Each structure stands twice: as structure tokens, then as C-alpha cells.
Ligand binder design. Structure first.
Ligand SMILES: O=C(O)CNC(=O)c1nc(Cl)c2ccccc2c1O
Ligand SMILES: [Zn+2]
Length: 447
């Protein structure tokens, strides 16, 4: 009555190394020994420094339609202006000193910790490039270099902390008997295609895997028959997911007994995920506006269907992918940096102008001498956007009010911003668009 595994291998197993070579050869390990002790010291002090200053936060994430606080605490450090979205939650970088950077005030050591993980970034990048080089050499032996450079060009690291003591609510691994999970089976999302990932692991201080020691687990996608690998991690071990590993396999993190930090360096796919990018989108939308002076008499250059559609889509993007994402996190990074404070003021102001634009379009649609054909063209151009705007607003209000969110501290409690009451003359349109959307449809049905 024995079947395909339902089991896992560790180094305690003879088959371990050969299974590693045959079924997970794009997973690479570099033991703590291969990293200079000086770098170890700076990186671990930087972990503890960011921990004492309270810079790591559990994210109020979303999964299969459920609001869930993560057991693990996190901070995103990386290129200025860059974001990384996972589980419907866009993390904004705490900036690190990339060349030609602006020294935006931060707590004393905080900036020095960010500088440190930049240093670790450079290092791991060198290692990753070396390993992909070696990997290709094997490839050509048995059977571009710009591709390598870019698949290793880490623009962010996502730091994680868990204390299994003060966070004892951990799920059991369901397929292979690997025990307690800090992070369940997953692929890392929103990374550049075929990009590598590098993880520096930092633990503080018989059948199957040792439950007291931290491991990273690996399995093949769709496959619980091939035995999973449970890799032991100690103080300063590094692992690397190369090439298509992250796509073809899943990984998890198995909890040990002691606290542990990790630094997971990534090539975030940020083509719609940078400040410069969303600023350019806002400028594009506002091209349709007469911009001599900034005031409330917003007047539009064209009502061509395509230009209005584009404008209302950009309105949506800045509102929900940026403003609401930033403020849903209650301004926690204000604890680490001020970098995003002016950028978010400026995006909020660009957004307010856009509430202005929408209003202008709604006045036009209701205009006396407007041939009903052109009117119908406008409605059909904008209706999808306005309806998606209304639904996404209902969802963010709720997500800000969930019973789980109200239980967060005052430093991290969500902020449903921007938000205004119906008795607010400062804003040209109501927050609740259901009336407006209904009317627009009733018209499009009109004989
Ligand atoms: O800490 C580690 O060794 C590895 N960390 C992660 O692999 C990791 N990556 C992602 Cl994208 C998520 C995403 C959501 C929750 C946990 C994650 C996680 O632990
Ligand atoms: Zn992961």
C-alpha cells in the first residue's frame, strides 16, 4: 500500500543530492562560508537595526477574496520610485542609495541599513550572474549576455522577519510531511520573466527534516508525487532561484524554532509600477485639459471617444493602483522615509484634477445641442471605466473597514483616502457613483 512519495528529502538522505541534480538543478545554494564575515556583520546589524526601529510590518493582504494579515513582517527596500505588487498589495520602496539619489531624511541608522542591503544587492547580483554563466556552460556542453545581466538586475529586496515564539500560529505542510510553514507553497509573482531571485537567510541562534531549523521547501508545480526538497538554512546561507525555477516549481518556508530574517532580492516587473511611469500617465490624461491656470473650471480640448476612455482609465489607475494602495497601508513607511510624501501629494492633486475632468465629461453628455449619436459614443467610451471605478471604491471602503483592519495599531490602521462626504463642496462629484452610472445606462437603452 505504498505510493508516489508523499515524502521529502533532506541532506540526511542518500537520494537528496541526486534528486537535487536531476529535478531542481536551477536551485543554487551558497553556504554562509562563501560570504565574507564583514559583510555578514553589516547585514545582520542592518536587520536588527530595522527591527528595533519598528520598520517591518505585517501586510493586510488579500487571497481568494479574504482579508488576511500575514504572520511574517516585511519591508520593501529598493530603487527610488519603484513598487512591487503581490497578493493585491502594492508595496512602495523604502529607497536605497542608487546613484544620483536624493538623500530624503530618514532615521539615523535606517539610511545606513538601506545602504547595507544595497551592498548585499551588488554582491548577490555578481554571484547570480556568475551562476547563470556556469549554468549556460553546462547547457552548451551537453546539448545573450544581456539576458543574463537583466535577469540578475535586482531592483528591490523584500525583507521578512518571523519570531515563531511570538507568532505560533503556523499551518502544517500538507503534501510531504515538512511540518510547520511560515510561508505556504507559492510562486513569487510579478517578476521579470525568467529572472533570478536571491535570498540571504539569517536564523538567530530522527525521521525527516529537523523542526528546530529553518528550511526552504521546493516542489514541482502540479506535482506532489515527486518528493519535495527541504533545504536547511542557517546563519547567513544564501539560495538562488535561477531562470525558469520560480515558474516551474513552488517554494515554501518551513519554520524553525528561533526567530529569523531573510532578504529576498528580485527583479520586479515594474513597467506600470514606477513613480515616473504613473506621473507620465497622469500628464497624458491631462493633455486633454486646458492648463493655463489651476482652478475648478476644468475645460476639455476634445470629446473624442478614445481620448475620454483613456482619461477615465488613467483616472482609475492613479486612484486605485496608487493612492488607495498607499493609504490603505496607513502610512507606515512614513516611519522609515518621507520619499513618497510629496510624490503622493502630487498624485493626489493630479487625481483631483481628474475628478474635475470626469465632471466636465458628465456636463458635456447632458448638453442641450448634442446629437444623441455623439452622446452615445461618449457613454459607450466611458461607461466601463465609471462602473469599474464604483465597484473598486465599494471594495476599498470595505477593505479599509474589515473587522481585521480595525484591530491594527494606530501606526498602521488603513486610511480610506481619498474620501469625502456628500456634503463636501470641495469635491465636484460624489464618492458614490451608483446614481450617475445608472443614469448613463438608462440613456444608452433609450429609444
Ligand atoms: O523568506 C524567504 O526565505 C522567502 N520569502 C519568500 O519566498 C516570499 N515571497 C513572496 Cl512573493 C511572498 C509573498 C507573500 C507571502 C510570503 C512571501 C514569501 O515568504
Ligand atoms: Zn517566495
Amino acid at each position: 500500500g505504498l505510493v508516489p512519495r508523499g515524502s521529502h528529502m533532506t541532506p540526511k538522505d542518500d537520494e537528496f543530492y541526486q534528486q537535487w541534480q536531476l529535478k531542481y538543478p536551477k536551485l543554487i545554494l551558497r553556504e554562509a562560508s562563501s560570504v565574507s564575515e564583514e559583510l555578514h556583520k553589516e547585514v545582520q546589524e542592518a536587520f536588527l537595526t530595522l527591527h528595533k526601529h519598528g520598520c517591518l510590518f505585517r501586510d493586510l493582504v488579500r487571497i481568494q477574496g479574504k482579508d488576511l494579515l500575514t504572520p511574517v513582517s516585511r519591508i520593501l527596500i529598493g530603487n527610488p520610485g519603484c513598487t512591487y505588487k503581490y497578493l493585491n498589495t502594492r508595496l512602495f520602496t523604502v529607497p536605497w542609495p542608487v546613484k544620483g539619489s536624493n538623500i530624503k531624511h530618514t532615521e539615523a541608522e535606517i539610511a545606513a541599513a538601506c545602504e547595507t542591503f544595497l551592498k548585499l544587492n551588488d554582491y548577490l547580483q555578481i554571484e547570480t550572474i556568475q551562476a547563470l554563466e556556469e549554468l549556460a556552460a553546462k547547457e552548451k556542453a551537453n546539448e545573450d549576455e544581456v539576458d543574463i545581466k537583466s535577469r540578475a538586475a535586482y531592483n528591490v529586496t523584500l525583507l521578512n522577519f518571523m519570531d515563531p515564539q511570538k507568532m505560533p500560529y503556523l499551518k502544517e505542510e500538507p503534501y510531504f510531511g515538512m511540518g510547520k510553514m511560515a510561508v505556504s507553497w507559492h510562486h513569487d509573482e510579478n517578476l521579470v520573466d525568467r529572472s533570478a531571485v536571491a535570498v540571504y537567510s539569517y536564523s538567530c541562534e530522527l525521521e525527516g527534516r529537523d523542526p528546530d531549523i529553518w528550511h526552504v521547501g521546493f516542489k514541482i508545480s502540479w506535482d506532489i508525487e515527486t518528493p519535495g526538497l527541504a533545504i536547511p538554512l542557517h546563519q547567513g546561507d544564501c539560495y538562488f532561484m535561477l531562470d525558469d525555477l520560480n515558474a516551474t516549481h513552488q517554494h515554501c518556508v518551513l519554520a524553525g524554532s528561533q526567530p529569523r530574517f531573510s532578504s529576498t532580492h528580485r527583479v520586479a516587473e515594474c513597467s506600470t509600477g514606477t513613480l515616473d511611469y504613473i506621473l507620465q500617465r497622469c500628464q497624458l490624461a491631462l493633455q486633454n485639459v486646458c492648463d493655463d491656470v489651476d482652478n475648478d473650471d476644468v475645460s476639455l480640448k476634445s470629446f473624442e471617444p478614445a481620448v475620454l476612455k483613456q482619461g477615465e482609465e488613467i483616472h482609475n489607475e492613479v486612484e486605485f493602483e496608487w493612492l488607495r494602495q498607499f493609504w490603505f497601508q496607513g502610512n507606515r513607511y512614513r516611519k522609515c522615509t518621507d520619499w513618497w510624501c510629496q510624490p503622493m501629494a502630487q498624485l493626489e492633486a493630479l487625481w483631483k484634477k481628474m475628478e474635475g475632468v470626469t465632471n466636465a465629461v458628465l456636463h458635456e453628455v447632458k448638453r442641450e445641442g448634442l446629437p444623441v449619436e455623439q452622446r452615445n459614443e461618449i457613454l459607450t467610451a466611458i461607461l466601463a471605466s465609471l462602473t469599474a471605478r464604483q465597484n473598486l471604491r465599494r471594495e476599498w471602503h470595505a477593505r479599509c473597514q474589515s473587522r481585521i483592519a480595525r484591530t491594527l495599531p494606530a501606526d498602521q490602521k488603513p486610511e480610506c483616502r481619498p474620501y469625502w462626504e456628500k456634503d463636501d463642496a470641495s469635491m465636484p462629484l460624489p464618492f458614490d457613483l451608483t446614481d450617475i452610472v445608472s443614469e448613463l445606462r438608462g440613456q444608452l437603452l433609450e429609444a
